[PDB]
Design a protein around this nucleic acid. Structure first.
Ligand SMILES: [Mg+2]
Ligand SMILES: [Mg+2]
Ligand SMILES: [Mg+2]
Ligand SMILES: [Mg+2]
Ligand SMILES: [Mg+2]
Ligand SMILES: [Mg+2]
Lengths: 90, 189, 180, 256, 89, 226, 59, 213, 251
RNA sequence: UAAAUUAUGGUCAAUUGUUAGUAUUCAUAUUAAUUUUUUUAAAUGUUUUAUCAUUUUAUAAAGGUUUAUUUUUGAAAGAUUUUUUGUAUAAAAUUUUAGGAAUAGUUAAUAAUAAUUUAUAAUUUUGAUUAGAUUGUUUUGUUAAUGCUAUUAGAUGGGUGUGGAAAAAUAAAAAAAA
């Protein structure tokens, strides 16, 4: 039965098409990948707050550095003269 | 459907014992004096008595002493045969016996027949040596049985033994002994 | 192992037994009736929640008209709809890793979804059950049997590890000059 | 009926037996609370333990705090002796003579060839260590055992000038054994347990006396208080019982 | 249940059940046939069992690892921030 | 646990089997081990309609008024022997009749010799208890030309399903020692003409045609008219 | 089957055999006294066939 | 096995070390009596109730936990059983087998064990009461049995106790021995209340190492 | 089922559910049941390679004192028939007990006699098994049994000392299961044999004009059967094999 | 101790009684409920097996508990053979009564001890123990709202101690080895 089926299975062309349900497990983990709308440390609802704020986990931190070089005085003409509209650069 | 969870553990694989729930409640005082009276009713003892703690059966020793205090029947033995029959029942029917009869003791027992009563006895013992105890006979067995059929002058039983010798299990019958009950002479001497 | 068996709701093998995937709902007037795919133990208590491993989904056994989609002249799509929410990761976990059991009606659902081949209990009573004999089967098998290693490699990729390392990613991951 | 159904003190699993055994095969009984009985109860003490090679050789010289005349210690130990001998006179060979009482600050093995260089050097470094330390008033109460109940001694309680002692000791320890390689029976980075040895069982004795001092003798004195004593004098000594009625002394330092 | 037909070996007893399961060689053969069929089913079935097991294990490998990536970066960030606050302290 | 049916495959409860393993499933109940059993009810069940029109006496009824004609006693005995073989023959009923209590003879139960099943017992020794028809029976199992290394108590010796055949060749006196018969693969060089293997580990029998008829005439493939 | 088992007080209809416990479960409390001691000479009187066969044995 | 000789070898080669400072007891902790869980678990002396990832210096064991096995007759309510009961002492390393017997005699709490004189034996061979554990190579892994006076008489029906199932217990012996303490005549709370195993537990043949059918 | 971790349930002193300790009784047949299949293995070993304490001469002699710290466990083979000093002699004529020596007697040396010996104090034992004739096994020259006259005066004996009523462990037979080859079938091709030139190889399989004679047609059994042996977990014969392969049971 | 913008962002808090000098949450209001109405339940025979037995089938009877209720895999899941592992029974917090007094097989150390081991013991006014009432720590109603006001039910000692676990004596609506 197995072999017959493999045969007529591989014979049809509408197989060889990935089936999202059959092929994998999207997310194995018990906890969600990103924050969805659950109440905050103040007890306020998901709709009442946006993630990425002051409650979010902290991001943390002689001569000259490599950040000194790239920088340039606006008095001197820059690298390739991209035609900025004057109004925008104002 | 096992009684595992209905009765005490020790009652597992309990078969053939009458109304086993009895032996569950025997500890309670009333059931217990009921048992005292029961044992006394069974007799064989000097004292008030009760079967031990979790035991459903009676003890081996007690039923043995019941069996050996129980008076045998036949209190009048006359022929040597009846003596030997009572001895036969003493040895080989003794409670929980290991030992088993030998064809030679059946010879010895079949040689004492006189009256037809005794023939009935020895034939019942023979019935016991075939059916009950499963013992193979010898050649001379049917010789002995034949001459003992002849002593009391009943030859019906001989030919009845001949027409079917397989159920009684005589595996060898000398053909001349067949002739004797089948219509031909020259048997003895 | 109960002295007096609870007679009406028997089960195999004591409590709580295997994890099993059941379909269940409180009983009501047929018009509103819904079911729940639930992973739970074999022996339930008064309330189904005491032993509940996971909640696999709602299933509504009322063919529905699709008013969500714009009314479509395609023939097929205007058949009525049957709506079911499967949680497929807890399914593949419980069934795959934890080795679940299955009642039959959930099986039929999960078959319509392409998670499982159709059940044992779905019978077109048109065909009979097949016959069998060892030497005809044997002739067919001698005719077609694949090579040993091809098959071993199949069993490898299906059961054991799938994602493997082709030459290029090895060559891409091995350390360069200052530590090479 | 007079207490808990299963007394909590009786609940014991032995994991040094085996996974399947005690369920099925056999049951193992023991009196398990002799083994559990702790370091406070037995009177044991964990002394700096020697490395094997050092464990082989006898000690020769030791550091000692010398006890002055008119101690509280010597007096009360004498009373203790009297009481002990009246109870059991089998102690008589165990007991140390009240004349030989001293505090042991550390023990050491000196080879006999380099002997003079080492006593000179030691004495010098020792004098340098204790130059700044003024006299020490220490407290003695409680008893304890070394060497599996063979050595019975009086503890030095860390309630007093003891703190200074520990620094002081830990200095000579890092000089004597650290600087000029000398065999201190332990590691020079570890501190010795200071003690007053009261009763003792030597290797020769062990046949007539027994393998351990029976705890029935010193049980009642186990926590007894021997009092405070101030000590100005440090010695480095070679072990001889004969010469002065006291240990033969190869060096001294005065704390003042 | 286990089906006990009428042509199974009847037991004559008043002390117990009326019919013992014991089989006419026919019934036995029949049973073997039906069983074979069902075997054909469970083959695919538990095959799919171990397929989903590896699926889930693999997806766990990938996602859990990504989680360790992100999480460790977080944890390092916090630790940096803390020891900074202690320099400031 | 140890040895499942079709590996673990759980798709049904019956999919496992009627037992999960040969071994006892609870360690506290040993006798639950998988044996080969025999229908004790039917195969004891001795016929009391052979005992009709008989007048059996009893063991402890010895009385003079009690017992009966020697002819009566004889036909009674015959009806009792007829009572005991009324289903089949117990081993101790076969062995008491053979010379030397049938030591060395090959005792096969009926079903062991039919179908692809081939098995018997080479009897090592026997104990008769005071009662015959009961007892203990030791021996060597031989299964498809393969033989046991040491003797074993022969199981279900007391159930009357047993046949054997007396050969003088195999008989051993009580003096000597019953040898275990040769396992045909090892001690005797295998030969096709003397012994051919009925069935081997991967083999099974072809379909008998009338079973097939019955099953199709059942499932309704081949029609059947009243 | 079921009708046979029904006569038992089994609470769950379990195909187990469970007896009762009557008030008098044993002979002595049901009034019955022992068993009558058999007269031995009475049952040692030879039977009819035996005497008749003495009659054809002496002829 | 592997572990035994691996560790023995390690000890032996650690003692032959010329240069070692010795351990620092500040870095070598003892064990705790304080840990989660209700039960008090006794472990090996090289093991601890916390997680210690570093392997400690091999030490010689100065108290060896010997096990000594006895035969006992348990009342199982269908009759007597013969099963095994261990006593476990802590015997000082250099101790004499005489002294080991003495330890054993002091450490058993069962009234049914030490009644008469007994000899310690390994694999059937008796040991000298005179000599040390050192000579007989007794490692705590060793199997040590204990043989009583009457133990070779047990194959009879005399020395082996008589169960009220098959034997008379008389007014003679109701006032003596395990028979007395047992209270054969059933009480309301049912007496000492021993363990029971039924007759058909092992089948018709009793428990064996060899499969008898 | 697996054995559980520890017993916290019942008091230890009372010990509760315990598999009975198996003891070997020398009065009964069961004794031999244990000891016999060992002996055969032992003798087999002796037929191939040397083992030190197996062959010895002139019995053994020890004091009354050291009797039990030396003897128990001892197993050795002597040439003649002489029964040990100070042992009451018991003949084993009971058939059941004898029965277990069947394999050893047919496929190794034939057993002439078995003897159970008990001493004056009754606390020792000796199992004494006298074989008649040469082995039905081949014996190698460098083997232990090659030092004996009774093999290769045709009677010789095996002596086994033991304590009574002990578990079937401390009779020491399991140290003997070392397996050495019988070199008899290859002795033919050694440089030593002169029949090595009468040997001829089959390198190629011979050309086959036939097929195997088809087995007798299958008769389906007529009686009542206990059901699938698969589903009942019965090994194929109730004898040996895996429960997954149902070969040779009724079908 | 300075303002702020690259401009409405991060998603709705919103209160409705016709009274009677004045002081004080108090009759008649709405919402929620009981008064209030047969459209969601249901009937008995659990079941195999090797036969007088043995395998499978573990939390709805009542009693009134406020410092109170806590636990394993040895069963099944479960995959190949045999050994094979360790993890558990313990705690912390929340605890009612208008007018308030002592409680008790009793604490801690010893230990597989002690119906008479040792001790200056334990619980209580920071509210105990008895006694009353009462089914404990995601469930309701009212409300703009810190509140007020509900929440069922379910673990009731031991006495041959079976069983992995006592949850084991009608009262299912859990397919229980084809
Ligand atoms: Mg309730
Ligand atoms: Mg109250
Ligand atoms: Mg609390
Ligand atoms: Mg608590
Ligand atoms: Mg399992
Ligand atoms: Mg009760």
């Amino acid at each position: 039965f197995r072999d017959v089926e493999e045969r007529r299975h591989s014979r049809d062309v509408v197989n060889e098409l990935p089936n999202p349900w059959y092929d994998y497990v999207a997310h194995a983990l018990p906890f969600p990948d990103r924050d969805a709308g659950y109440p905050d440390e103040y007890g306020d609802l998901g709709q009442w707050r946006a993630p990425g704020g002051p409650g979010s986990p902290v991001r943390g931190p002689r001569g000259y550095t490599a950040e000194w070089r790239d920088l340039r005085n606006p008095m001197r003409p820059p690298e390739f003269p991209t035609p900025w509209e004057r109004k925008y650069r104002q | 459907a096992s009684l595992r969870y209905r009765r005490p553990y020790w009652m597992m694989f309990l078969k053939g014992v009458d109304n086993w729930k009895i032996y569950t409640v025997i500890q309670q005082p009333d059931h217990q004096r009921t048992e005292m009276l029961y044992q006394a009713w069974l007799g064989g003892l000097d004292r008030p008595y009760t079967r031990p703690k979790c035991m459903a059966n009676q003890p081996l020793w007690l039923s043995k002493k019941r069996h050996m205090l129980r008076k045998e029947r036949l209190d009048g033995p006359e022929t040597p045969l009846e003596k030997y029959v009572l001895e036969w029942h003493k040895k080989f029917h003794s409670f929980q016996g290991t030992e088993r009869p030998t064809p030679d003791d059946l010879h010895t027992a079949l040689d004492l027949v006189e009256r037809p009563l005794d023939l009935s006895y020895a034939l019942q013992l023979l019935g016991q040596c075939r059916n009950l105890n499963n013992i193979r006979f010898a050649k001379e067995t049917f010789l002995v049985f034949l001459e003992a059929c002849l002593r009391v002058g009943r030859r019906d039983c001989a030919e009845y033994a001949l027409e079917h010798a397989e159920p009684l299990g005589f595996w060898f019958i000398d053909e001349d002994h067949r002739r004797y009950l089948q219509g031909e002479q020259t048997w003895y001497k | 192992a109960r002295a007096v068996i609870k007679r009406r709701s028997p089960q195999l093998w004591g409590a709580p037994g295997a994890p099993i995937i059941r379909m269940r709902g409180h009983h009501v007037v047929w018009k509103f009736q819904s079911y729940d795919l639930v992973v739970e133990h074999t022996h339930k208590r008064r309330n189904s929640d005491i032993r509940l491993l996971h909640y696999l989904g709602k299933h509504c056994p009322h063919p529905q008209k699709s008013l969500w989609s714009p009314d479509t002249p395609v023939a097929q799509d205007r058949h009525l709809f049957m709506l079911t929410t499967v949680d497929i990761d807890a399914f593949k976990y419980w069934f795959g890793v934890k080795r679940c059991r299955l009642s039959m009606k959930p099986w039929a659902l999960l078959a319509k979804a392409g998670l499982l081949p159709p059940s044992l209990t779905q019978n077109s009573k048109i065909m009979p059950k097949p016959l069998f004999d060892k030497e005809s089967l044997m002739r067919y098998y001698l005719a077609n049997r694949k090579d040993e290693d091809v098959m071993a490699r199949e069993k490898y990729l299906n059961y054991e590890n799938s994602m493997v390392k082709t030459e290029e990613e090895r060559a891409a991951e091995r350390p360069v000059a200052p530590y090479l | 009926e007079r207490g808990l159904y299963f007394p909590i003190n009786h609940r014991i699993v032995d994991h040094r037996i085996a996974p399947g055994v005690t369920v099925e095969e056999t049951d193992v009984q023991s009196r398990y609370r002799r083994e559990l009985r702790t370091n406070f109860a037995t009177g044991e003490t964990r002394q700096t333990i020697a490395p094997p090679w050092s464990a082989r050789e006898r000690p020769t010289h030791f550091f000692s705090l010398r006890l002055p005349s008119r101690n509280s210690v010597t007096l009360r130990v004498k009373e203790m002796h009297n009481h002990l001998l009246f109870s059991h006179q089998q102690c008589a060979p165990m007991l140390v003579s009240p004349t030989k009482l001293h505090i042991t600050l550390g023990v050491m093995t000196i080879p006999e060839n380099s002997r003079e260089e080492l006593v000179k050097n030691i004495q010098q470094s020792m004098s340098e260590t204790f130059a700044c330390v003024q006299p020490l008033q220490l407290r003695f109460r409680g008893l304890g055992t070394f060497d599996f109940g063979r050595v019975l001694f009086i503890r030095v309680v860390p309630e007093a000038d003891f703190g200074r002692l520990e620094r002081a000791v830990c200095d000579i320890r890092r000089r004597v054994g650290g600087v000029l390689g000398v065999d201190l029976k332990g590691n020079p980075h570890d501190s010795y347990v200071p003690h007053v040895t009261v009763a003792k069982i030597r290797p020769n004795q062990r046949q007539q006396l027994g393998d351990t001092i029976p705890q029935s003798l010193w049980a009642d004195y186990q926590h007894h208080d021997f009092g405070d004593v101030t000590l100005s004098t440090v010695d480095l000594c070679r072990m001889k019982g004969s010469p002065d009625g006291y240990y033969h002394t190869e060096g001294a330092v005065h704390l003042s | 249940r286990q089906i006990r037909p009428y042509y199974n070996l009847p037991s004559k007893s008043e002390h117990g059940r009326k019919m013992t399961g014991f089989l006419t060689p026919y019934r036995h053969w029949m049973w073997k046939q039906n069983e074979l069929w069902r075997n054909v089913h469970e083959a695919q079935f538990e095959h799919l069992r171990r397929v989903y097991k590896r699926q889930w294990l693999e997806s766990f490998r990938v996602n859990a690892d990504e989680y360790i990536y992100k999480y460790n970066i977080t944890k390092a960030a916090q630790l940096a921030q803390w020891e900074c606050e202690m320099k400031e302290q | 646990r140890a040895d499942p049916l079709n590996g673990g495959s759980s798709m049904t409860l019956g999919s496992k089997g009627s037992k999960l393993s040969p071994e006892p499933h609870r360690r506290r109940m040993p006798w639950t081990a998988a044996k080969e059993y025999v229908p004790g009810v039917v195969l004891n069940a001795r016929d009391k309609m052979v005992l009709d029109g008989v007048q059996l006496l009893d063991i402890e009824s010895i009385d003079r008024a009690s017992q009966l004609d020697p002819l009566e006693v004889l036909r009674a005995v015959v009806a009792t022997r007829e009572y005991n073989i009324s289903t089949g023959k117990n081993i101790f009923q076969l062995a008491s009749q053979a010379t030397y209590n049938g030591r060395g003879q090959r005792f096969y139960r009926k079903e062991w010799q039919e179908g692809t099943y081939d098995k018997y017992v080479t009897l090592s020794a026997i104990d008769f208890d005071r009662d015959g028809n009961k007892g203990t029976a030791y021996g060597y199992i031989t299964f498809h030309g393969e033989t046991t290394t040491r003797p074993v108590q022969v199981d279900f010796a007391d159930v009357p399903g047993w046949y054997m055949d007396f050969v003088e060749e195999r008989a051993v006196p009580f003096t000597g020692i019953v040898p275990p018969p040769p396992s045909i693969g090892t001690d005797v060089p295998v030969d096709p003409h003397s012994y051919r293997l009925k069935a081997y580990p991967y083999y099974d029998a072809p379909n008998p045609p009338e079973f097939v008829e019955r099953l199709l005439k059942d499932r309704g493939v081949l029609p059947d008219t009243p | 089957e079921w009708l046979y088992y029904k006569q038992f007080k089994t609470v769950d209809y379990s195909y187990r055999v469970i007896p009762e416990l009557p008030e008098k479960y044993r002979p002595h409390q049901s009034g019955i006294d022992q068993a009558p001691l058999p007269d031995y000479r009475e049952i040692n009187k030879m039977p009819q066939w035996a005497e008749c066969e003495e009659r054809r044995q002496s002829k | 096995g592997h572990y035994q000789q691996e560790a023995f070898e390690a000890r032996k080669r650690f003692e032959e070390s010329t240069t070692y400072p010795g351990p620092i007891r500040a870095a070598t902790p003892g064990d705790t009596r304080f840990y989660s869980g209700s039960l008090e678990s006794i472990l090996h002396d090289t093991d601890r109730h916390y997680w210690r990832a570093v392997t400690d210096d091999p030490r010689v064991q100065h108290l060896i936990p010997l096990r000594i096995r006895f035969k006992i007759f348990t009342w199982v309510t269908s009759g007597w059983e013969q099963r095994m009961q261990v006593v476990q002492i802590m015997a000082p390393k250099d101790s004499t087998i005489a002294q080991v017997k003495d330890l054993v005699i002091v450490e058993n709490q069962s009234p049914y064990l030490c009644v008469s004189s007994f000899h310690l034996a390994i694999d059937g061979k008796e040991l000298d009461p005179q000599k040390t554990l050192g000579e007989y190579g007794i490692t705590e892994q060793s199997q040590i049995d204990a043989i009583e006076q009457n133990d070779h008489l047990l194959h009879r029906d005399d020395e082996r106790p008589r169960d009220w199932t098959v034997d008379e217990i008389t007014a003679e012996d109701v006032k003596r021995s395990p028979y007395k303490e047992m209270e054969m005549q059933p009480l309301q709370n049912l007496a000492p209340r021993y363990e029971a195993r039924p007759k058909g537990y092992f089948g018709r043949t009793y428990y064996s190492g060899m499969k008898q059918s | 089922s697996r054995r559980f971790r520890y017993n916290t349930k019942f008091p230890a002193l009372v010990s509760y559910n315990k598999l009975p300790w198996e003891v070997v009784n020398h009065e009964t047949p069961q004794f031999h049941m244990h000891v016999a299949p060992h002996y055969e293995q032992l003798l087999t070993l002796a037929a191939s390679s040397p083992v030190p304490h197996i062959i010895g001469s002139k019995h053994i002699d020890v004091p009354r004192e050291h009797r039990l710290r030396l003897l128990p466990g001892m197993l050795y083979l002597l040439d003649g028939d002489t029964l040990p000093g100070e042992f009451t002699i018991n003949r084993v004529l009971d058939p059941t007990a004898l029965q277990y020596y069947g394999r050893l007697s047919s496929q190794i040396v034939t057993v002439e006699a078995v003897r159970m010996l008990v001493p004056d104090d009754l606390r020792l034992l000796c199992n004494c098994i006298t074989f008649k004739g040469p082995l039905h096994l081949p014996v190698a020259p460098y083997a232990s049994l090659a030092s004996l006259r009774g093999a290769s005066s045709n009677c010789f004996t095996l002596y086994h000392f033991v304590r009574p009523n002990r578990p079937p462990k401390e009779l020491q037979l399991e140290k003997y299961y070392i397996h050495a080859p019988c070199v008899a079938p290859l002795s033919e091709f050694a440089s030593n044999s002169d029949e090595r030139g009468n040997w001829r190889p089959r390198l190629q399989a011979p050309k086959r004009t036939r097929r195997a004679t088809p087995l007798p047609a299958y008769r389906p059994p007529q009686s009542y059967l206990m059901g699938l042996a698969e589903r009942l977990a019965v090994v194929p014969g109730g004898c040996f094999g895996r429960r997954s392969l149902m070969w040779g049971h009724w079908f």
